[PDB]
Amino acid sequence: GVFTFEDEITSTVPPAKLYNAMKDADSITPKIIDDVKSVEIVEGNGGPGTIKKLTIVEDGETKFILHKVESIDEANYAYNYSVVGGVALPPTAEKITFETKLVEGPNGGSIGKLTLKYHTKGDAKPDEEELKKGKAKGEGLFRAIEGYVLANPTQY
Ligand SMILES: O=C(O)/C=C/c1ccc(O)c(O)c1
Ligand SMILES: O=C(O)/C=C/c1ccc(O)c(O)c1
């Protein structure tokens, strides 16, 4: 089945700037997020169909995560990717999709809109715990991009 959740998050940074930073997330996230060590393009050119290997450290243990890039709408500050591999993905789960979109906040800031689509095998429902982890992963992504931008203002 497919189980669908939505979260939102605010920033002071405007969306255009924040979105350009999302594009460089493969180079940003390993710097600012401690667990993340690197992000390698394994197959593809960075566009839809691309597979990325993330290398995590979770309790002094090296783990891998595989992302599939699903779509990229730069007009709508949108970036959609799927977790398709690794330990972070549950054995009950076919895949987990992160659909991101930045939109304008009411003070010239921005609003991160996450739609999380958790694809299960058969009649399994998602684990309430792995939902907390998934939502948390998405926050840390956003905070990393935001942090990078605020710490490097001339960059964007
Ligand atoms: O966790 C959330 O609620 C939103 C996350 C989010 C939203 C938009 C982006 O461009 C992004 O990298 C992350
Ligand atoms: O939650 C995490 O720990 C890392 C998330 C992450 C890391 C690298 C990316 O390019 C991305 O879109 C998301």
TrEMBL record:
PROSITE patterns: PATHOGENESIS_BETVI
Domain Bet v I/Major latex protein: 1-152
InterPro entries for the chain: Bet_v_I/MLP, Bet_v_I_allergen, Plant_def-hormone_signal, START-like_dom_sf
A GO MF term: signaling receptor activity
Family named by the database record: Belongs to the BetVI family.
Keyword Repeat in record: no
Any Pfam family the entry gives: Bet_v_1
GO cellular component labels: cytoplasm; nucleus
Alphabetized UniProt keyword annotations: Pathogenesis-related protein, Plant defense
GO terms of biological process kind: abscisic acid-activated signaling pathway; defense response
Taxonomic superkingdom: Eukaryota
Protein name: Ara h 8 allergen
